[PDB]
Structure formats: structure tokens, C-alpha cells
Amino acid sequence: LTDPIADMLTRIRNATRVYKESTDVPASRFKEEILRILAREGFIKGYERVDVDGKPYLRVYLKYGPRRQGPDPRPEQVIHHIRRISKPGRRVYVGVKEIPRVRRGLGIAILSTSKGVLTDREARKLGVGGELICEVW
Amino acid sequence: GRYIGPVCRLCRREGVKLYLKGERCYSPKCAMERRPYPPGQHGQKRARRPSDYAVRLREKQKLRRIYGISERQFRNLFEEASKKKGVTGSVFLGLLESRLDNVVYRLGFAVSRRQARQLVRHGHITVNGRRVDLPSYRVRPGDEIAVAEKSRNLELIRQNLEAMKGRKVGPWLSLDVEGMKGKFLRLPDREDLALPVNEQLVIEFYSR
Amino acid sequence: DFEEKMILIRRTARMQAGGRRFRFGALVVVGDRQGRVGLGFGKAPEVPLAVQKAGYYARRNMVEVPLQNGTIPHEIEVEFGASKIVLKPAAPGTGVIAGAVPRAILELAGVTDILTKELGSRNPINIAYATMEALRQLRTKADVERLR
Amino acid sequence: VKELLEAGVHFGHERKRWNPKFARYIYAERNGIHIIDLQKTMEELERTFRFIEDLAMRGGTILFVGTKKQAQDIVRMEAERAGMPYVNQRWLGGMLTNFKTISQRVHRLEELEALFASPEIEERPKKEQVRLKHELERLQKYLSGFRLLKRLPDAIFVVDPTKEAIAVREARKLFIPVIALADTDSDPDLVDYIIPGNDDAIRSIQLILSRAVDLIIQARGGVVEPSPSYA
RNA sequence: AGCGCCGGCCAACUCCGUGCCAGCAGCCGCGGUAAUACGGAGGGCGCGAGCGUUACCCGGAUUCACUGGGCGUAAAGGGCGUGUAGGCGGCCUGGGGCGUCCCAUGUGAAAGACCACGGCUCAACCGUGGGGGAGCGUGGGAUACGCUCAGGCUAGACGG
RNA sequence: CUGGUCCACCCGUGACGCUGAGGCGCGAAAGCGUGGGGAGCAAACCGGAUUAGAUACCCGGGUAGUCCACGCCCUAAACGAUGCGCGCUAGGUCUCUGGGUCUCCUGGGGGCCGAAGCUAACGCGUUAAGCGCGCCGCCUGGGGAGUACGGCCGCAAGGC
Ligand code: SF4
Ligand SMILES: [Mg+2]
Ligand SMILES: [Mg+2]
Ligand SMILES: [Mg+2]
Ligand SMILES: [Mg+2]
Ligand SMILES: [Mg+2]
Ligand SMILES: [Mg+2]
Ligand SMILES: [Mg+2]
Ligand SMILES: [Mg+2]
Ligand SMILES: [Mg+2]
Ligand SMILES: [Mg+2]
Ligand SMILES: [Mg+2]
Ligand SMILES: [Mg+2]
Ligand SMILES: [Mg+2]
Ligand SMILES: [Mg+2]
Ligand SMILES: [Mg+2]
Ligand SMILES: [Mg+2]
Ligand SMILES: [Mg+2]
Ligand SMILES: [Mg+2]
Ligand SMILES: [Mg+2]
Ligand SMILES: [Mg+2]
Ligand SMILES: [Mg+2]
Ligand SMILES: [Mg+2]
Ligand SMILES: [Mg+2]
Ligand SMILES: [Mg+2]
Ligand SMILES: [Mg+2]
Ligand SMILES: [Mg+2]
Ligand SMILES: [Mg+2]
Ligand SMILES: [Mg+2]
Ligand SMILES: [Mg+2]
Ligand SMILES: [Mg+2]
Ligand SMILES: [Mg+2]
Ligand SMILES: [Mg+2]
Ligand SMILES: [Mg+2]
Ligand SMILES: [Mg+2]
Ligand SMILES: [Mg+2]
Ligand SMILES: [Mg+2]
Ligand SMILES: [Mg+2]
Ligand SMILES: [Mg+2]
Ligand SMILES: [Mg+2]
Ligand SMILES: [Mg+2]
Ligand SMILES: [Mg+2]
Ligand SMILES: [Mg+2]
Ligand SMILES: [Mg+2]
Ligand SMILES: [Mg+2]
Ligand SMILES: [Mg+2]
Ligand SMILES: [Mg+2]
Ligand SMILES: [Mg+2]
Ligand SMILES: [Mg+2]
Ligand SMILES: [Mg+2]
Ligand SMILES: [Mg+2]
Ligand SMILES: [Mg+2]
Ligand SMILES: [Mg+2]
Ligand SMILES: [Mg+2]
Ligand SMILES: [Mg+2]
Ligand SMILES: [Mg+2]
Ligand SMILES: [Mg+2]
Ligand SMILES: [Mg+2]
Ligand SMILES: [Mg+2]
Ligand SMILES: [Mg+2]
Ligand SMILES: [Mg+2]
Ligand SMILES: [Mg+2]
Ligand SMILES: [Mg+2]
Ligand SMILES: [Mg+2]
Ligand SMILES: [Mg+2]
Ligand SMILES: [Mg+2]
Ligand SMILES: [Mg+2]
Ligand SMILES: [Mg+2]
Ligand SMILES: [Mg+2]
């Protein structure tokens, strides 16, 4: 595996499209600091550090909208979109002045900074820029 | 120069009275009362659905033919309004109404914009006390547009200001009759006019 | 009541022994100018029936499209197969910046100010469907924190 | 109104011909057969019977839908008990989404209900006459319970949602509550008010249907006891 | 007071003449005896001391796609391996601080551009003021991620 | 004599990995060089038919070649017209081959039908053409043309 972070953004994306209750992610500190963001921001009910076949994983507890009426009752997603930005093949660094607003503020951007992992709104609060990890809405 | 040709065929093509003659436009002799169809051979033929480019071109000729202004200036003034602060439609209208020759017409010194233009180009109008013979001069909030001293004793503006005693000029304006001077108080808002034009379509025209 | 606009009329054709025999397709959006739009495609053997048939279906396929001072709440891109519409909110004094097909949809929804751009197949029909699905996916802050 | 010893009729079947979306109502796969858990059914009946009783309480109308062999006659009885519309034999496409058009076949029905209600004129060709007596029966063969359905229903109660996906699909398209009893071979997401359980045992089909109708009587005033639980 | 245009794109139509001729044509296309497409005329549309044309640049062209494209059948997977350089790389702890982020400071000429105000009657033109950056030099700081060095692990990989 | 590969135990090494411009090797048939072999078959070729013709299809013959050894050539509808690696996202059915506690459970392959999703549609769908990351190859209207010039390769044909 070549990008553990994009793997986790994708494990969740695939899990929410089949409306799974939870999905396990290979465990790592940087991934906690990203799931830390996703829970506090409402995108996931949260996570816990578990143990699958002896190895540390991260059970992510997903979340969905209300059951809808019409054909296709499947509920609208709470994470509509979770997209890698900086990749091993092309790193993306923005200073504080060029941090993007995701969907006119109705979405978040997770970044890595020398003050820790923040949301876009957290970054301008601390006045720092960093590496654009992903955008989510 | 400006269009110096027949003028009733203008309203006939646009399909609405454009008060471009003064007196005649309020009599039964106005050609928009008698024949309200486009001029020329096929006017009385029943119209087809025009294209949306036609709808916008027509709104933009209506606005331009109101002020009797060349397309070059009408587009020049549009582009200043565009790049200006925010609301383009209001600014284009306000900058249009800021023209001296127009202000002479709104003040009532002249009965038509064509005549108003001539009152200026012949020097009969001054701005804050100086002869200003430029039709496109931009009047701004504060100025006093008057009739020249060597002009105030001339039949035309005497009679014109007479019927102006009976008229109530626009709010953004001021008029002291018998002194034959007026004041431009502020550039008009949107609703200060009910110009037979949807200026939003004019923006749509140039955005193609 | 609601207001109608005929975006598209077109003549199609099938074949038989004898020659071509025609049909007519009517693509009509109907709006309230205050947040209700609908899109309908009506096909019939003559132009008036289709134009009238499409306006029927239109009234039974409406979208909420929640305005915000005449503009949409957030930027949106939708693909309907090779057809792609981009919509970006825009300030007051800007206008509706769209080709004829999405304009008829946005203007009938009461959108007074927006930036659009078509991409890929600018096939009017599929562009019209993709514009409707774009409006259908418009969210507000009250929509999203309720979800979270 | 319910039971706990209903586990003596069905608790599921259909061997490994399942729908994976049903697993959250399955307790174990024992004798080759998927076994349905009824503690999942008991909670669900509490939902469905909450919906059914509350629906009749305000003047509702449930279109009962049964078509297969094991549920053919029982759905006729139970819907006639509560005076409810049933569809017995074939589900005519559009019956819901094209209601104002199929209902145009019950007016033709009522016509031959007047004609062969002696006499208008029977003295018009017997061939032309007995022509109609066959058109009369056919209309009765398919519109016998749908005729009392005078307006688009408030909900539908189907025996098999897989076997009856057409009816479900129409009702889902009309924002009509789809309530149904279904075993291991169907899609829970398509049912608004689910009754997980066998839909092939007549011993079970009648059970969850007959004493569901009983609940409909007590919600529109007064009770009755005996219905056909034929053996 | 002139110039272009009036088949669709694309705003503006009738009569005559011509008869696959004479001709038009940016593309699709017009003309073979009732041509809104050729030529003239009436009328009409667009501009106006201009209006057309040709040439060329950018745009429309997300048609070189960083923003922002693709490759089963539309153009597009190398006939297949092996492997050099190179690109890229799992979990945990720390040392550094190269990338990266921040703060301070120097440089970023004038003119131009943009905003405000004013001088030529206006304007074009022009004066006066204002406001910025990126990039680089330097000083201070941060250490999540990328880098490196060091130590540990076993999920990748390899061997018994 | 020799390769690959799978499975069981979870015993050893401790990220030793993935991809891969160049390079190098392999590369159906046909063809080429030198020997050898030659039943059958059969380009070319000869004859008999058919036909307006019949430099064909049909028939009777028949030389390369088809076969072997070594050395070349390096092409293809060399196809799954689908690059390699890895992770993730319902199941049902048939089969090959392992392991177990032998209903079945579990690996590694080979097919069919299909969830979600993708697709212009056809269709794809845990053997992805779905959702993702890495790296490589390649496309950018048709014809001219895989031609010319140049370069490298080849005995030549001709290949890149
Ligand atoms: S007289 Fe009538 S038609 Fe003529 S210019 Fe005045 S308003 Fe127009
Ligand atoms: Mg920077
Ligand atoms: Mg005159
Ligand atoms: Mg523009
Ligand atoms: Mg432009
Ligand atoms: Mg809303
Ligand atoms: Mg696409
Ligand atoms: Mg399309
Ligand atoms: Mg295209
Ligand atoms: Mg096109
Ligand atoms: Mg069944
Ligand atoms: Mg022109
Ligand atoms: Mg034009
Ligand atoms: Mg036109
Ligand atoms: Mg040209
Ligand atoms: Mg003739
Ligand atoms: Mg002809
Ligand atoms: Mg003629
Ligand atoms: Mg022509
Ligand atoms: Mg032409
Ligand atoms: Mg002509
Ligand atoms: Mg000029
Ligand atoms: Mg160009
Ligand atoms: Mg454009
Ligand atoms: Mg470009
Ligand atoms: Mg090109
Ligand atoms: Mg790109
Ligand atoms: Mg392309
Ligand atoms: Mg091809
Ligand atoms: Mg291949
Ligand atoms: Mg090759
Ligand atoms: Mg290497
Ligand atoms: Mg590296
Ligand atoms: Mg790393
Ligand atoms: Mg540094
Ligand atoms: Mg500077
Ligand atoms: Mg400077
Ligand atoms: Mg200056
Ligand atoms: Mg300056
Ligand atoms: Mg071990
Ligand atoms: Mg060890
Ligand atoms: Mg070979
Ligand atoms: Mg050979
Ligand atoms: Mg040989
Ligand atoms: Mg021989
Ligand atoms: Mg012969
Ligand atoms: Mg022969
Ligand atoms: Mg012969
Ligand atoms: Mg012969
Ligand atoms: Mg032979
Ligand atoms: Mg032979
Ligand atoms: Mg021989
Ligand atoms: Mg093959
Ligand atoms: Mg190929
Ligand atoms: Mg490759
Ligand atoms: Mg194989
Ligand atoms: Mg298999
Ligand atoms: Mg599907
Ligand atoms: Mg894709
Ligand atoms: Mg299909
Ligand atoms: Mg198929
Ligand atoms: Mg398939
Ligand atoms: Mg499978
Ligand atoms: Mg090429
Ligand atoms: Mg080429
Ligand atoms: Mg070749
Ligand atoms: Mg060659
Ligand atoms: Mg050569
Ligand atoms: Mg090649």
C-alpha cells in the first residue's frame, strides 16, 4: 500500500455508499488526528481503537441521513464527498492566505500544520498554513 | 454624428412611444397612435417569435435610441458601469442620466433631447457659471445647470420654461423657473425612472 | 400561477415502407420565479400536443432549489453522462451568466445572479437534466448541521 | 392482539435463495433453510400494527395485494372482512399509477351490472348478448375487489413484495406506504412497514393476515371473532 | 454621408431579371423556369466619418486538460518478461529542521494597471495622492506532514 | 535435467517494497543461411472443368515449404482489441486444484448471472470497465502514411 491516508478516505467512501454501520481502518496516529476532525465536525459518530486478528485497527462509526420517501428510500449522505488532495505523487502546500473554502463554508478542509491537524476554519484561527490533506463535505 | 433621421419609425420598430419629439408625442398626430407597427413594407404582416438575441438587441436599441446617443458612447458608458462597484444596471442608467444634454432636457430647458443637445452645442447652457457646450459633459451631484445670460432673452427657453411652471421635475433634480437655473442633487436611483426598458437585458446583450 | 418557457422543440423521425414519419419533442421548464422549477419532456405526433404534454410532466417534477438573496447557496457541478454544468454563486450586481438552456431553468427558479458554464456534451436535453439535478443537490447550513 | 406461539407455523424458509439485505432479520441458517427470528418480528409487528390500527382509525383504506397460489383465497376473505379492497388474480399494470384509466374499466363493469340486471333490453341478439356475459365475468375475474377501491389508497398490504414488485414499484412512486410481510428473498428497504416472516405457509399467511384484519375492525368500532382459518 | 448586411448560425423581405448560366460562399450550403442565398430595385437591419475586407495574436477550444481530458468497441496499453536510472513507499519513538507553515525586516525604480481627487469647457490626454503582492536576501519561531539520521516492531515483502 | 505455482504449520530475516525511461532476454506463422530429412499436405506451376473471361472458387497433378539441427529474421486480429502492484465495495451458480472438524468452512485458479456503482450505449461488475494511491506505456480529426528523408538493425525480405 502506497498512501495510507487516501486508503482511509476511500475505505470510508466505499463504506458509506453501501450504508454500512462501521468500517475498520489500519491504525495509525496521523489517521486518528484526521478521524478526530471528522467526528468533532459531525461527519462520523466517532471511532474507537480496536484489534482485528491481532492487529491494531480503527473502527469508524459512520452516519447517514433520514430514510427518504419515493422510489429509492436510501438516505442522503452525511459525508457527500471526501477527496484526497495532497498525494505522494504531488504534494499540495498552501500558506494561510490561500486556504480554500470548501463549498462556501458548508464543508471542511483537513490540513497538516506545524500546530497539528486542523480544519480550514481552525487554520485561519491559529493563522497558520500547511499541507492540504483532503476536502470533505 | 448622432442620428439625424426620421424619428417616429424608431418607436414603431421598438413597439412603444419614445418621447423623442416633444409636443407632437402627446397629440393624436403622434405616429405611434396611428400606426403602432414596424415601419416599411412588412409592418402589418403578423410577427414571428423573435430569437432571444433579438429580444436583447431590441431592449438595447430602445435604451440607446431614447438618449439619441451613438453606440460607441453607449458602449463606452456601459463598460464604465460594468467595471464599477457592483450594481451595473443602476450605474449605467445613472451615468446615462448624468449627461449634460439629457439634464437640459430633464430640467425642461428643452422639449426634446435632440433640441436639448442643440441648446448645449450652441452654447445656450452653462455649468456652474461657465459656458459648457459639450453634449456628453458629465453632470455630477451639486452643479447648477442654467441658461446663459446672452440667451435667457430668447423665445425658445422662455416658452419652454413657461410650460415647465406647470411641470414637476424629477426628485433628484431642482428647478428655479424665472431664474432659469436648476440643480443636479444626486444621480438617480433605479426606480427614479420608469424607462420603458429592462436594463437587465442590456447587460445580457453585451455578456454574449 | 406558474410560468412556462419552451427551451426546445425538435422533430424526430422513424422509418417505414413509404418513407419517414415524424414525431415532435418538447423540452419545457415551468417555474414560480420564487423557488419552484420543473422540467418536462413531452413527445407527441404534433407540435402543440407535445408542447402541452411536456408542461404537464414539468408540473409533476419540481425541485425545492433554495435561493439566498437570488443566488444558490454553494458551488455545484453535476454530470449527467458526458454533459456537465458548473454553477457558482455570485454577488448582487452581476446577473445570470448562462447559456440559453440553463438560463431558462435558473431564471424560472428565481435565480437572479449566478455564474454557470457548460462542459462536455452541451446537448440541451442532457444539459437540462444535469442542471435540474444540480439544483436538486443544493444544501444550506441549516440543512447540513441538521444532518450532522 | 399479537402472539408469541406464532412460532408454531412458519419462522421462515427458502434455502439459500436469499437477499443479503435481509440478514438483519435472520437468526440462524439451520436445516438448509434460513430461520427468521421473531423477536425481530415482534418489534416489527408493533410497528406495523401501530401503523395499521392508526390508519383505519382516521378513515384509511388499505389495498390488500395477494396473487400467488398459497395466498389467493385468504386475501379475498380478509379484505372482505374489513371491507377492504383486494387484488386477487392478476395485478394490472398501472392499476395505481394509471388509476383514473383502469377505474374506467369498473364503470364498464357497473354498466353490465345494470344491463344484465333485467332487462334494459335482453331482446337484442343473443350472440351480441352472450358476447357480454363473458366480458362481464372477465371484469369480475380481475376487478372484484379493486372496484371498491374508488380512490388512490392510503397504503397497500402485500403478501410477497418480490412476487409483487410491480405493485410495490407503483406505490413507491406515488408516495404510498408500502406495508408487507416478506421472507428471506426480498428487499427490506422497499417496504415501509415490514412484517418479517414466511409468505408461503398458508398456516402462516392466514395467521399474520387474519389477525391483522382483526386489528382493523377494532380501529373502526367494534370487534368480530371468527374468520376462515381453514385447515 | 456614407459603408456593410437582410437562407440558418445572426438583427433585417418582397418584386423583377437570370434558369447548374451568370454568379454567391466564414461553415452548413445556394442557382436545373414562381430563388427571402446570384444581379438590380423597393423596403428593412446594423454602425456612422466611417464602414467593410485581408493578414496575424488570445478567446470561445476541458481541442496539450496544473486549475481542467482521456486509452474494451470512438484516436489511444508497449507482443511478453527481466531489470538500470528515476518516481513513489507500512507501524511505533526520538535527534535535526532540508521541504513546508508563521512573524519580523530589506529589495521589488520611474511610467503603466487599479481606487480616490483635481487640471485642459468634457473626454481622450495629463498631474497629485493611496493601496497591495508574488519572488528573493536576512533575523526569530513551529515540527503535524514530506525529508534525513538513529533505535524498536511485524501487518507488506522474503525464507524455513 | 530444470522453471513457475499453490496449500498447511506461523518457525527465521525485519520494509529487505511497488513500478520501471534506457538495457537485456523470450517471442505464432511465414520467410532467410548451412547441412539433413521428405509419407502426407501444398504457395508457385501444369492440366481438367466452369465462365463473356476465370491468371479463381471445384477436380487430377505438383516444386519450395511444412519436419530435424544450428544460426538468423522480430512481425501479428502477438486480443480479454482491457499495463503492473496494492487496498476497499452484496451475493447466487458451475467447475479445477489444495487444507480442515469432510453439511460445509477455508485458500489459489477457471466461467456464467448479477448489489452498489460505472458506461455514449453495448456492456463491466471481488478475474472491474466500480471507489482509491503509485509508476510506466500511449492518444490529440480523416486521407497522405506506417509512406518519405535521416538514423540503427538485417544475408535478404524487410524491421524499429
Ligand atoms: S410622435 Fe410618437 S411615434 Fe413619433 S417620436 Fe414621438 S412618441 Fe415616437
Ligand atoms: Mg508558499
Ligand atoms: Mg425633424
Ligand atoms: Mg465577455
Ligand atoms: Mg467572451
Ligand atoms: Mg433545502
Ligand atoms: Mg464522462
Ligand atoms: Mg450527455
Ligand atoms: Mg464536444
Ligand atoms: Mg453540437
Ligand atoms: Mg416466493
Ligand atoms: Mg453586418
Ligand atoms: Mg451579429
Ligand atoms: Mg432573423
Ligand atoms: Mg475570416
Ligand atoms: Mg423566367
Ligand atoms: Mg425549382
Ligand atoms: Mg422568377
Ligand atoms: Mg449567397
Ligand atoms: Mg449571404
Ligand atoms: Mg438579393
Ligand atoms: Mg466618431
Ligand atoms: Mg483561435
Ligand atoms: Mg462566449
Ligand atoms: Mg486553452
Ligand atoms: Mg487542434
Ligand atoms: Mg489533469
Ligand atoms: Mg477526449
Ligand atoms: Mg481502434
Ligand atoms: Mg497486453
Ligand atoms: Mg516490439
Ligand atoms: Mg530502485
Ligand atoms: Mg524515497
Ligand atoms: Mg512515509
Ligand atoms: Mg525551514
Ligand atoms: Mg512592490
Ligand atoms: Mg513600480
Ligand atoms: Mg497618471
Ligand atoms: Mg501614480
Ligand atoms: Mg513469527
Ligand atoms: Mg526479531
Ligand atoms: Mg519468431
Ligand atoms: Mg517456421
Ligand atoms: Mg530452411
Ligand atoms: Mg516431397
Ligand atoms: Mg485447363
Ligand atoms: Mg484451373
Ligand atoms: Mg463459356
Ligand atoms: Mg474460353
Ligand atoms: Mg489442388
Ligand atoms: Mg496431392
Ligand atoms: Mg512425390
Ligand atoms: Mg484468442
Ligand atoms: Mg494494440
Ligand atoms: Mg507497463
Ligand atoms: Mg492461467
Ligand atoms: Mg472463484
Ligand atoms: Mg443498478
Ligand atoms: Mg472514471
Ligand atoms: Mg442492458
Ligand atoms: Mg447481458
Ligand atoms: Mg456480468
Ligand atoms: Mg464472485
Ligand atoms: Mg501516432
Ligand atoms: Mg496522422
Ligand atoms: Mg510494417
Ligand atoms: Mg518503413
Ligand atoms: Mg531509410
Ligand atoms: Mg509497433
mmCIF file of N, CA and C in Angstrom, chain B residues 16-50:
data_model
loop_
_atom_site.group_PDB
_atom_site.id
_atom_site.type_symbol
_atom_site.label_atom_id
_atom_site.label_comp_id
_atom_site.label_asym_id
_atom_site.label_seq_id
_atom_site.Cartn_x
_atom_site.Cartn_y
_atom_site.Cartn_z
ATOM 1 N N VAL B 16 -43.165 50.909 -28.766
ATOM 2 C CA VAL B 16 -43.537 51.707 -27.599
ATOM 3 C C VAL B 16 -43.148 53.155 -27.871
ATOM 4 N N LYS B 17 -43.975 54.083 -27.385
ATOM 5 C CA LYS B 17 -43.684 55.506 -27.522
ATOM 6 C C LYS B 17 -42.343 55.850 -26.887
ATOM 7 N N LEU B 18 -41.451 56.421 -27.683
ATOM 8 C CA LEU B 18 -40.207 57.005 -27.195
ATOM 9 C C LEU B 18 -40.348 58.502 -27.417
ATOM 10 N N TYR B 19 -40.573 59.243 -26.339
ATOM 11 C CA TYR B 19 -40.972 60.643 -26.457
ATOM 12 C C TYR B 19 -39.778 61.439 -26.969
ATOM 13 N N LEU B 20 -39.625 61.413 -28.294
ATOM 14 C CA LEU B 20 -38.448 61.934 -28.971
ATOM 15 C C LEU B 20 -38.754 63.160 -29.816
ATOM 16 N N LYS B 21 -39.968 63.707 -29.720
ATOM 17 C CA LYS B 21 -40.349 64.904 -30.464
ATOM 18 C C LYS B 21 -40.883 66.039 -29.595
ATOM 19 N N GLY B 22 -41.256 65.787 -28.353
ATOM 20 C CA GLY B 22 -41.807 66.846 -27.514
ATOM 21 C C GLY B 22 -43.317 67.003 -27.707
ATOM 22 N N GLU B 23 -43.719 68.116 -28.332
ATOM 23 C CA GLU B 23 -45.144 68.426 -28.467
ATOM 24 C C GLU B 23 -45.898 67.305 -29.177
ATOM 25 N N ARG B 24 -45.476 66.973 -30.402
ATOM 26 C CA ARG B 24 -46.206 66.030 -31.249
ATOM 27 C C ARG B 24 -46.484 64.690 -30.569
ATOM 28 N N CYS B 25 -45.679 64.305 -29.575
ATOM 29 C CA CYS B 25 -45.815 62.994 -28.950
ATOM 30 C C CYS B 25 -47.024 62.893 -28.031
ATOM 31 N N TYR B 26 -47.692 64.004 -27.734
ATOM 32 C CA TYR B 26 -48.856 63.996 -26.858
ATOM 33 C C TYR B 26 -50.146 64.336 -27.590
ATOM 34 N N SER B 27 -50.095 64.489 -28.900
ATOM 35 C CA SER B 27 -51.245 64.759 -29.738
ATOM 36 C C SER B 27 -51.702 63.489 -30.434
ATOM 37 N N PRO B 28 -52.924 63.468 -30.972
ATOM 38 C CA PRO B 28 -53.332 62.327 -31.806
ATOM 39 C C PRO B 28 -52.520 62.191 -33.085
ATOM 40 N N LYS B 29 -51.642 63.152 -33.387
ATOM 41 C CA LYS B 29 -50.842 63.134 -34.604
ATOM 42 C C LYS B 29 -49.562 62.324 -34.461
ATOM 43 N N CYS B 30 -49.164 62.009 -33.230
ATOM 44 C CA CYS B 30 -48.084 61.062 -32.990
ATOM 45 C C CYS B 30 -48.293 59.791 -33.802
ATOM 46 N N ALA B 31 -47.274 59.429 -34.581
ATOM 47 C CA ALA B 31 -47.365 58.271 -35.457
ATOM 48 C C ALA B 31 -47.406 56.953 -34.696
ATOM 49 N N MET B 32 -47.196 56.969 -33.381
ATOM 50 C CA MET B 32 -47.376 55.760 -32.591
ATOM 51 C C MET B 32 -48.831 55.547 -32.193
ATOM 52 N N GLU B 33 -49.645 56.606 -32.199
ATOM 53 C CA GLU B 33 -51.086 56.426 -32.057
ATOM 54 C C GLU B 33 -51.669 55.774 -33.303
ATOM 55 N N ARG B 34 -51.319 56.306 -34.473
ATOM 56 C CA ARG B 34 -51.991 55.934 -35.713
ATOM 57 C C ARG B 34 -51.596 54.528 -36.162
ATOM 58 N N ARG B 35 -50.306 54.313 -36.424
ATOM 59 C CA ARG B 35 -49.789 53.025 -36.893
ATOM 60 C C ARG B 35 -48.736 52.507 -35.922
ATOM 61 N N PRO B 36 -49.113 51.610 -34.972
ATOM 62 C CA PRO B 36 -48.173 51.066 -33.984
ATOM 63 C C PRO B 36 -47.535 49.747 -34.423
ATOM 64 N N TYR B 37 -47.140 49.663 -35.680
ATOM 65 C CA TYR B 37 -46.453 48.501 -36.215
ATOM 66 C C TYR B 37 -45.158 48.929 -36.888
ATOM 67 N N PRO B 38 -44.180 48.025 -36.986
ATOM 68 C CA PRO B 38 -42.858 48.388 -37.537
ATOM 69 C C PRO B 38 -42.982 49.077 -38.882
ATOM 70 N N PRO B 39 -42.052 49.972 -39.208
ATOM 71 C CA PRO B 39 -42.124 50.686 -40.486
ATOM 72 C C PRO B 39 -41.809 49.763 -41.650
ATOM 73 N N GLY B 40 -42.040 50.274 -42.849
ATOM 74 C CA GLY B 40 -41.684 49.546 -44.045
ATOM 75 C C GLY B 40 -42.727 48.548 -44.502
ATOM 76 N N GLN B 41 -42.308 47.756 -45.490
ATOM 77 C CA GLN B 41 -43.256 47.015 -46.316
ATOM 78 C C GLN B 41 -44.033 45.988 -45.507
ATOM 79 N N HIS B 42 -43.387 45.355 -44.532
ATOM 80 C CA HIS B 42 -43.945 44.173 -43.887
ATOM 81 C C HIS B 42 -44.465 44.441 -42.482
ATOM 82 N N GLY B 43 -44.638 45.711 -42.108
ATOM 83 C CA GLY B 43 -45.076 46.027 -40.758
ATOM 84 C C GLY B 43 -46.371 45.335 -40.377
ATOM 85 N N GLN B 44 -47.368 45.389 -41.258
ATOM 86 C CA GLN B 44 -48.673 44.816 -40.952
ATOM 87 C C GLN B 44 -48.730 43.307 -41.157
ATOM 88 N N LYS B 45 -47.620 42.671 -41.515
ATOM 89 C CA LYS B 45 -47.558 41.219 -41.504
ATOM 90 C C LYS B 45 -47.374 40.734 -40.072
ATOM 91 N N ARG B 46 -47.993 39.603 -39.741
ATOM 92 C CA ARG B 46 -48.050 39.182 -38.346
ATOM 93 C C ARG B 46 -46.709 38.607 -37.913
ATOM 94 N N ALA B 47 -46.211 39.087 -36.780
ATOM 95 C CA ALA B 47 -44.829 38.833 -36.411
ATOM 96 C C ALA B 47 -44.616 37.374 -36.043
ATOM 97 N N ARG B 48 -43.381 36.920 -36.221
ATOM 98 C CA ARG B 48 -42.957 35.611 -35.762
ATOM 99 C C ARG B 48 -42.271 35.740 -34.409
ATOM 100 N N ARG B 49 -42.126 34.607 -33.737
ATOM 101 C CA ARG B 49 -41.380 34.556 -32.492
ATOM 102 C C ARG B 49 -39.954 35.045 -32.732
ATOM 103 N N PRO B 50 -39.527 36.139 -32.109
ATOM 104 C CA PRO B 50 -38.142 36.585 -32.268
ATOM 105 C C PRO B 50 -37.202 35.723 -31.440
#
